[PDB]
Enzyme design. Structure first.
Site, PDB file in Angstrom:
ATOM      1  N   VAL A 139       0.844  -1.160   0.000  1.00 18.33           N
ATOM      2  CA  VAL A 139       0.000   0.000   0.000  1.00 18.33           C
ATOM      3  C   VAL A 139       0.892   1.226   0.000  1.00 18.33           C
ATOM      4  O   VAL A 139       1.747   1.364   0.806  1.00 18.33           O
ATOM      5  CB  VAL A 139      -0.972  -0.003   1.169  1.00 18.33           C
ATOM      6  CG1 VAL A 139      -1.786   1.255   1.197  1.00 18.33           C
ATOM      7  CG2 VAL A 139      -1.872  -1.195   1.099  1.00 18.33           C
ATOM      8  N   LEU A 140       0.688   2.116  -0.931  1.00 20.96           N
ATOM      9  CA  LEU A 140       1.611   3.207  -1.064  1.00 20.96           C
ATOM     10  C   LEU A 140       1.106   4.495  -1.587  1.00 20.96           C
ATOM     11  O   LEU A 140       0.464   4.515  -2.581  1.00 20.96           O
ATOM     12  CB  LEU A 140       2.666   2.759  -2.071  1.00 20.96           C
ATOM     13  CG  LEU A 140       4.114   3.017  -1.770  1.00 20.96           C
ATOM     14  CD1 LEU A 140       5.012   2.373  -2.785  1.00 20.96           C
ATOM     15  CD2 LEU A 140       4.357   4.483  -1.799  1.00 20.96           C
ATOM     16  N   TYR A 173      -4.690   1.239   9.869  1.00 20.59           N
ATOM     17  CA  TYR A 173      -5.618   0.216   9.403  1.00 20.59           C
ATOM     18  C   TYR A 173      -6.770   0.005  10.386  1.00 20.59           C
ATOM     19  O   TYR A 173      -7.915  -0.217   9.963  1.00 20.59           O
ATOM     20  CB  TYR A 173      -4.842  -1.075   9.116  1.00 20.59           C
ATOM     21  CG  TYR A 173      -3.968  -0.916   7.900  1.00 20.59           C
ATOM     22  CD1 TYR A 173      -4.541  -0.762   6.643  1.00 20.59           C
ATOM     23  CD2 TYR A 173      -2.575  -0.873   7.997  1.00 20.59           C
ATOM     24  CE1 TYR A 173      -3.771  -0.598   5.516  1.00 20.59           C
ATOM     25  CE2 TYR A 173      -1.784  -0.703   6.855  1.00 20.59           C
ATOM     26  CZ  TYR A 173      -2.407  -0.565   5.622  1.00 20.59           C
ATOM     27  OH  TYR A 173      -1.691  -0.394   4.469  1.00 20.59           O
ATOM     28  N   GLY A 182      -0.996  12.620   3.820  1.00 14.89           N
ATOM     29  CA  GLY A 182      -1.628  13.545   4.741  1.00 14.89           C
ATOM     30  C   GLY A 182      -2.848  14.236   4.188  1.00 14.89           C
ATOM     31  O   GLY A 182      -3.362  15.163   4.826  1.00 14.89           O
ATOM     32  N   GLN A 183      -3.333  13.805   3.029  1.00 15.03           N
ATOM     33  CA  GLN A 183      -4.470  14.425   2.368  1.00 15.03           C
ATOM     34  C   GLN A 183      -5.675  13.505   2.310  1.00 15.03           C
ATOM     35  O   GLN A 183      -6.658  13.827   1.640  1.00 15.03           O
ATOM     36  CB  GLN A 183      -4.090  14.861   0.952  1.00 15.03           C
ATOM     37  CG  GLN A 183      -2.852  15.728   0.903  1.00 15.03           C
ATOM     38  CD  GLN A 183      -2.498  16.126  -0.510  1.00 15.03           C
ATOM     39  OE1 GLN A 183      -3.297  15.962  -1.432  1.00 15.03           O
ATOM     40  NE2 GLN A 183      -1.298  16.640  -0.692  1.00 15.03           N
ATOM     41  N   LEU A 198      -5.744  10.554   0.923  1.00 16.88           N
ATOM     42  CA  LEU A 198      -5.761   9.738  -0.291  1.00 16.88           C
ATOM     43  C   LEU A 198      -5.505   8.273   0.034  1.00 16.88           C
ATOM     44  O   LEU A 198      -6.126   7.382  -0.558  1.00 16.88           O
ATOM     45  CB  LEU A 198      -4.732  10.259  -1.293  1.00 16.88           C
ATOM     46  CG  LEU A 198      -4.982  11.678  -1.818  1.00 16.88           C
ATOM     47  CD1 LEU A 198      -3.901  12.085  -2.790  1.00 16.88           C
ATOM     48  CD2 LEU A 198      -6.361  11.772  -2.467  1.00 16.88           C
ATOM     49  N   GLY A 199      -4.624   8.012   0.999  1.00 13.66           N
ATOM     50  CA  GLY A 199      -4.382   6.640   1.415  1.00 13.66           C
ATOM     51  C   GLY A 199      -5.620   5.976   1.978  1.00 13.66           C
ATOM     52  O   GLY A 199      -5.914   4.820   1.664  1.00 13.66           O
TER      53      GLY A 199
HETATM   54  C1  LIG Z   1       1.071  -2.701   2.703  1.00 12.21           C
HETATM   55  C2  LIG Z   1       0.883  -3.073   4.129  1.00 12.21           C
HETATM   56  O1  LIG Z   1       0.127  -3.968   4.342  1.00 12.21           O
HETATM   57  S1  LIG Z   1       1.691  -2.300   5.385  1.00 12.21           S
HETATM   58  C3  LIG Z   1       1.302  -0.627   5.049  1.00 12.21           C
HETATM   59  C4  LIG Z   1       2.256  -0.037   4.039  1.00 12.21           C
HETATM   60  N1  LIG Z   1       2.572   1.365   4.286  1.00 12.21           N
HETATM   61  C5  LIG Z   1       3.820   1.862   4.201  1.00 12.21           C
HETATM   62  O2  LIG Z   1       4.665   1.492   4.983  1.00 12.21           O
HETATM   63  C6  LIG Z   1       4.162   2.858   3.096  1.00 12.21           C
HETATM   64  C7  LIG Z   1       4.449   4.285   3.535  1.00 12.21           C
HETATM   65  N2  LIG Z   1       3.318   5.067   3.932  1.00 12.21           N
HETATM   66  C8  LIG Z   1       2.449   5.542   3.091  1.00 12.21           C
HETATM   67  O3  LIG Z   1       2.543   5.325   1.928  1.00 12.21           O
HETATM   68  C9  LIG Z   1       1.344   6.374   3.660  1.00 12.21           C
HETATM   69  O4  LIG Z   1       1.752   6.983   4.844  1.00 12.21           O
HETATM   70  C10 LIG Z   1       0.143   5.553   4.053  1.00 12.21           C
HETATM   71  C11 LIG Z   1      -0.351   4.747   2.884  1.00 12.21           C
HETATM   72  C12 LIG Z   1       0.630   4.608   5.093  1.00 12.21           C
HETATM   73  C13 LIG Z   1      -0.964   6.413   4.602  1.00 12.21           C
HETATM   74  O5  LIG Z   1      -1.478   7.239   3.599  1.00 12.21           O
HETATM   75  P1  LIG Z   1      -1.736   8.758   3.753  1.00 12.21           P
HETATM   76  O6  LIG Z   1      -2.179   9.310   2.526  1.00 12.21           O
HETATM   77  O7  LIG Z   1      -0.590   9.296   4.371  1.00 12.21           O
HETATM   78  O8  LIG Z   1      -2.875   8.776   4.814  1.00 12.21           O
HETATM   79  P2  LIG Z   1      -4.224   9.502   4.792  1.00 12.21           P
HETATM   80  O9  LIG Z   1      -3.983  10.903   4.811  1.00 12.21           O
HETATM   81  O10 LIG Z   1      -5.167   8.948   3.911  1.00 12.21           O
HETATM   82  O11 LIG Z   1      -4.623   9.157   6.212  1.00 12.21           O
HETATM   83  C14 LIG Z   1      -5.957   9.077   6.613  1.00 12.21           C
HETATM   84  C15 LIG Z   1      -6.133   8.902   8.116  1.00 12.21           C
HETATM   85  O12 LIG Z   1      -5.157   8.075   8.663  1.00 12.21           O
HETATM   86  C16 LIG Z   1      -4.624   8.635   9.801  1.00 12.21           C
HETATM   87  N3  LIG Z   1      -3.273   8.122   9.661  1.00 12.21           N
HETATM   88  C17 LIG Z   1      -2.475   8.332   8.635  1.00 12.21           C
HETATM   89  N4  LIG Z   1      -1.307   7.718   8.782  1.00 12.21           N
HETATM   90  C18 LIG Z   1      -1.378   7.080   9.913  1.00 12.21           C
HETATM   91  C19 LIG Z   1      -0.480   6.229  10.630  1.00 12.21           C
HETATM   92  N5  LIG Z   1       0.716   5.966  10.119  1.00 12.21           N
HETATM   93  N6  LIG Z   1      -0.885   5.755  11.782  1.00 12.21           N
HETATM   94  C20 LIG Z   1      -2.084   6.044  12.261  1.00 12.21           C
HETATM   95  N7  LIG Z   1      -2.964   6.796  11.652  1.00 12.21           N
HETATM   96  C21 LIG Z   1      -2.667   7.335  10.490  1.00 12.21           C
HETATM   97  C22 LIG Z   1      -4.836  10.096   9.592  1.00 12.21           C
HETATM   98  O13 LIG Z   1      -4.925  10.731  10.816  1.00 12.21           O
HETATM   99  C23 LIG Z   1      -6.178  10.148   8.961  1.00 12.21           C
HETATM  100  O14 LIG Z   1      -7.233   9.928   9.879  1.00 12.21           O
HETATM  101  P3  LIG Z   1      -8.691  10.496   9.731  1.00 12.21           P
HETATM  102  O15 LIG Z   1      -9.547   9.583   9.035  1.00 12.21           O
HETATM  103  O16 LIG Z   1      -9.111  10.517  11.109  1.00 12.21           O
HETATM  104  O17 LIG Z   1      -8.480  11.751   9.035  1.00 12.21           O
END
Ligand SMILES: CC(=O)SCCNC(=O)CCNC(=O)[C@H](O)C(C)(C)COP(=O)(O)OP(=O)(O)OC[C@H]1O[C@@H](n2cnc3c(N)ncnc32)[C@H](O)[C@@H]1OP(=O)(O)O
Ligand SMILES: CC(=O)SCCNC(=O)CCNC(=O)[C@H](O)C(C)(C)COP(=O)(O)OP(=O)(O)OC[C@H]1O[C@@H](n2cnc3c(N)ncnc32)[C@H](O)[C@@H]1OP(=O)(O)O
Lengths: 148, 150
Positions: free
Chosen positions: A84-85, A127, A92-93, A95-96
């Site tokens: 997931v990426l 998650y 922070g927008q 989109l994830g």
């Molecule tokens: C693939 C797997 O199974 S393991 C997961 C793989 N992830 C990685 O290690 C890759 C690196 N990270 C990323 O690419 C990104 O940070 C992601 C995909 C993890 C998150 O995507 P983003 O676009 O940053 O997150 P997005 O802004 O959609 O976050 C949405 C919500 O998550 C919360 N959130 C975001 N990141 C995190 C986190 N790391 N931990 C806890 N909560 C989080 C935010 O507060 C927000 O909450 P809301 O609904 O209350 O507003």
């Protein structure tokens, strides 16, 4: 649910979700480089993509690959979500989260009722917020001699 | 490691336990085997679809030919496999057969150059997998389910 959806439009660009499996392995490599993931042979990345039941993408169209998620599955009971990426420039927008919602919904539409993943400690709460539960009833995710 | 394998030959009358990764399981025997160990009836159409789209289907058979064990794995054919539905006929449990089945499964996945071999283990069989070399929560990684109902 349509193959392609516009998740967002802003003035400056739209953010496009797709489940068609439209990933160029160089694009995916460059994105993986931004989050510092070590490179793996392009042919193996390609093989992993065409043997994924679901490949879901985020693109920025003004096409730039800015996000992706994929899932293996047996097409009946189980799917496991991997890689997931989101591009750090676009994190922070929301989109994830939006990507993962469409992923979960596509799998449920396909009558996959057991949707799983292996979450890094750093992203466990991300998650949970989406409704995933760690160790339900004490079930453990296990790895055969992992190199982590 | 070959496709098909005599794990054991014994007597009581001569019995062989045969391993195979060919994947030619009879879905109706697998359906009865699933029932025998106490798993609810699943639709035949979904079980067959799960077999066809499983990267690996491994069986144990008793020839004196009866299906007595099964394990399967999904995979992306390159990086990851997840093992599902490991089961041994209760009349054949406690004989080392589940261990032997899993060992052949692991070796097959390794021969196919799959680095990351994973599964989700019920808490009452976690020690069974630990004994084969599986590790729970490495580096704090957590296996998670979307709104599970177990
Ligand atoms: C693939 C797997 O199974 S393991 C997961 C793989 N992830 C990685 O290690 C890759 C690196 N990270 C990323 O690419 C990104 O940070 C992601 C995909 C993890 C998150 O995507 P983003 O676009 O940053 O997150 P997005 O802004 O959609 O976050 C949405 C919500 O998550 C919360 N959130 C975001 N990141 C995190 C986190 N790391 N931990 C806890 N909560 C989080 C935010 O507060 C927000 O909450 P809301 O609904 O209350 O507003
Ligand atoms: C399906 C999944 O993805 S998770 C698996 C969930 N499966 C189930 O709960 C269904 C029912 N279980 C079974 O079918 C069988 O009990 C299996 C597959 C779990 C094990 O098969 P068996 O044939 O009983 O095991 P086998 O005799 O090969 O035992 C292997 C070793 O593990 C040990 N072992 C067996 N079962 C267990 C257990 N539940 N907990 C801990 N250790 C165990 C045995 O004592 C043996 O040890 P030893 O070699 O030191 O003597």
């Amino acid at each position: 649910l349509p193959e392609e959806l516009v998740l967002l439009e802003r003035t400056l660009e739209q953010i496009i979700f797709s489940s068609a499996g439209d990933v160029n392995v160089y694009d995916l490599q460059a994105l993986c480089d931004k989050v510092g993931w070590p490179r793996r042979p392009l042919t193996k990345i390609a093989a992993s993509l065409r043997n994924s039941y679901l490949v879901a993408t985020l693109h920025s169209v003004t096409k730039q690959l800015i996000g992706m998620a994929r899932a293996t599955s047996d097409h009946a009971f189980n799917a496991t979500i991997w890689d997931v990426l989101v591009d750090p420039s676009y994190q922070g927008q929301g989109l994830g989260k939006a990507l993962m919602e469409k992923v979960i919904r596509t799998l449920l539409q396909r009558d996959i009722s057991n949707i799983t993943l292996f979450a890094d400690n750093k992203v466990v709460d991300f998650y949970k917020n989406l409704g995933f539960e760690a160790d339900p009833q004490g079930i453990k995710g296990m790895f055969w001699y992992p190199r982590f």
